[PDB]
Design a protein around this ligand. Structure first.
Ligand code: FE
Ligand code: MN
Length: 278
C-alpha cells in the first residue's frame, strides 16, 4: 500500500498572486511519484526556477515542457534572453536541477500502467488552426486583430534566430517526429505538450480566433500513430478529460486565480498513470 503514481499539472502561473499556494500544495502520494508539468509554470526565469525547485524537491522526478509564457521575455526578467537561446537556457537550468526536459532522453514509466515511454515535447504553433473566414496565416491574424483577439506572444515570444514562430514550430515538429519514429512501435507512450495535439479541444474556447495560437495541424494523428495511452496538455485553461479515437486527453491546467476560484476541483494533480478508470 504505497504504489507510485505519475501525475500531471500545467499553467501554474506562480507569478500571479494567489497561485503560489496552489504550487505549494502539490505533494506526492509515495516517495516514487513522477510529476509532469505541461507548460506555463511562470514567465520570469527566476520564478520558473523557484517553482521547479520547489517541485523537484518533493517528487522523485519532474518532467517539464515549456509553454508559451516561459518563452516570453519581459522587461522585469533578470535574464534578457530570447528565442532558442532562452529555451536552451531553461533546458540547462532544468538539467542543473535534475528536471527532465524535451531535450533529455525520454523517461520510461516502469510501474503501474505498463511500460510507457513519456515523451516531453516542445512544438509551439504554426498558425495552421485557421478561423472559418481565413485561408492563410496573414488573413487569420488580420481577422483576429480586427476583432481584438491577439495573443501577447506576437510581441513577447521572440523566435530568433528563426524568422517567424511557425518556422521554429516546423523545425520542432520535424525533430520531434524524427525522435518519435525511433520508438518501439509496440510500447505505449504518454505524449506531453503544452498545446493540444489536435484542434477539437479548441472548440471549447469562448472565441474561436484564438485557436491560431493553440497548436499545429502537423500533429493531428500523433496520438494514434505513436500508440499513446494518454495525452497531457494545457494552455486552454479548460481543465477536463476527453477521449479522441480511443485516446485519453487530459487538460491539466490550473489557470489564473479568478478562473479556478469559480470552481472547486478535487485535488490539483491529475492522475496520468496508472489509468484512474474514470
Ligand atoms: Fe499557455
Ligand atoms: Mn496558461
Amino acid at each position: 500500500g504505497a504504489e507510485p503514481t505519475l501525475w500531471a499539472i500545467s499553467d501554474l502561473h506562480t507569478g500571479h498572486l494567489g497561485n503560489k499556494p496552489v504550487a505549494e500544495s502539490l505533494y506526492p502520494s509515495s516517495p516514487d511519484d513522477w510529476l509532469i508539468v505541461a507548460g506555463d509554470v511562470a514567465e520570469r526565469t527566476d520564478e520558473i526556477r523557484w517553482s521547479l525547485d520547489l517541485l523537484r524537491r518533493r517528487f522523485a522526478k519532474v518532467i517539464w515542457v515549456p509553454g508559451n509564457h516561459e518563452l516570453w521575455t519581459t522587461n522585469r526578467d533578470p535574464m534578457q534572453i530570447f528565442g532558442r537561446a532562452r529555451y536552451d537556457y531553461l533546458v540547462n537550468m532544468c538539467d542543473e536541477m535534475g528536471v527532465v526536459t524535451p531535450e533529455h532522453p525520454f523517461p520510461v514509466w516502469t510501474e503501474r500502467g505498463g511500460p510507457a515511454t513519456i515523451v516531453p515535447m516542445f512544438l509551439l504553433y504554426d498558425y495552421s488552426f485557421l478561423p472559418e473566414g481565413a485561408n492563410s496565416k496573414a488573413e487569420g491574424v488580420a481577422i483576429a486583430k480586427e476583432r481584438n483577439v491577439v495573443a501577447t506572444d506576437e510581441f513577447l515570444l521572440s523566435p530568433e534566430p528563426y524568422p517567424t514562430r511557425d518556422a521554429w514550430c516546423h523545425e520542432r515538429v520535424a525533430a520531434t517526429r524524427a525522435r518519435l519514429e525511433q520508438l518501439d512501435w509496440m510500447q505505449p507512450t504518454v505524449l506531453v505538450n503544452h498545446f493540444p495535439l489536435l484542434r477539437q479541444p479548441c472548440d471549447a474556447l469562448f472565441y474561436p480566433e484564438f485557436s491560431l495560437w493553440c497548436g499545429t495541424t502537423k500533429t493531428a494523428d500523433w496520438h494514434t500513430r505513436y500508440n499513446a495511452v494518454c495525452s497531457v496538455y494545457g494552455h486552454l485553461h479548460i481543465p477536463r478529460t476527453t477521449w479522441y479515437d480511443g485516446v485519453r486527453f487530459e487538460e491539466v491546467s490550473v489557470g489564473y486565480p479568478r478562473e479556478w476560484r469559480r470552481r472547486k476541483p478535487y485535488s490539483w494533480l491529475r492522475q496520468v498513470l496508472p489509468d484512474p478508470q474514470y
